[PDB]
Amino acid sequence: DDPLQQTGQLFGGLVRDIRRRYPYYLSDITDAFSPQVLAAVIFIYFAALSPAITFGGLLGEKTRNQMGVSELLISTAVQGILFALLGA
Amino acid sequence: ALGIKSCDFQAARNNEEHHTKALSSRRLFVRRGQPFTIILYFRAPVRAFLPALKKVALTAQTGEQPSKINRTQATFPISSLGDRKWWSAVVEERDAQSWTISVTTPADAVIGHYSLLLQVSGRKQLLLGQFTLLFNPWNREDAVFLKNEAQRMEYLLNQNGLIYLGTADC
Numbered sequence A: 001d002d003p004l005q006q007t008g009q010l011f012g013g014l015v016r017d018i019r020r021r022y023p024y025y026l027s028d029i030t031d032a033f034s035p036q037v038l039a040a041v042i043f044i045y046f047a048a049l050s051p052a053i054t055f056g057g058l059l060g061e062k063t064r065n066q067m068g069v070s071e072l073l074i075s076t077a078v079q080g081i082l083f084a085l086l087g088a
Numbered sequence B: 001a002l003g004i005k006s007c008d009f010q011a012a013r014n015n016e017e018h019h020t021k022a023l024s025s026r027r028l029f030v031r032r033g034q035p036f037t038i039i040l041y042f043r044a045p046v047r048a049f050l051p052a053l054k055k056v057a058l059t060a061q062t063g064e065q066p067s068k069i070n071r072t073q074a075t076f077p078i079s080s081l082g083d084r085k086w087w088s089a090v091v092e093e094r095d096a097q098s099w100t101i102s103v104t105t106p107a108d109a110v111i112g113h114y115s116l117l118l119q120v121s122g123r124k125q126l127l128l129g130q131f132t133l134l135f136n137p138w139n140r141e142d143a144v145f146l147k148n149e150a151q152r153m154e155y156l157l158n159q160n161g162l163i164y165l166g167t168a169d170c
């Protein structure tokens, strides 16, 4: 099975990928009980928070404070949870 | 969640029933028009049966350039009900890890070297094995069908013959 291929059906890639991936949902749920996952979480938390604050400060000082740090943080959280739940 | 470990063509079991015991004991030679039993081995036990039965099917391929217009290619699913006069396959015995399938073959098929393939709904096709198809006088629906049994023994399964020479007197 190829993840990428031309299919003569409209939206064929979407259905092919969902049927390829989604039966692994319980496996994805169960494989996260190791402490290495906790270490990765605590690492990536800072690794993603620091560039967020830096870019938020620069962006806020650039656009006359119309959009700032809190908006960037909440947006990052929103697509993070959404992509974690519904991502391939 | 489904993975096939290996397939076992029960050659030594159905080769004597197909009268091909003298031909081989490891390779699988089958006669057309007669069902034969094979065994499939899973990697993990199946949670549900019918949903797993729905999304898997198997094909038979033969010749250099197979096609459905030359009758050199066939596709059929693993179903509990179907036409017995064409290609079909029904599960006879179910285990936690293994299935026993009974494949049926049409009484009018192209002979030659065959290959069996299995297709998963998401994953690609996988080759299970190879077998050969031959005519049989034991099938009532075949063009070559011998009513007598001793005639079958003499004219098909015998290997020691006699050739008559000399004049018409001796």
Ligand SMILES: *[C@@H]1O[C@H](CO)[C@@H](O)[C@H](O)[C@H]1NC(C)=O
Binding pocket: A064, A065, A066
């Ligand atoms: C908020 O926007 C108004 C309207 O342009 C502006 O006068 C004010 O300075 C802004 N506040 C900031 C940049 O803190």
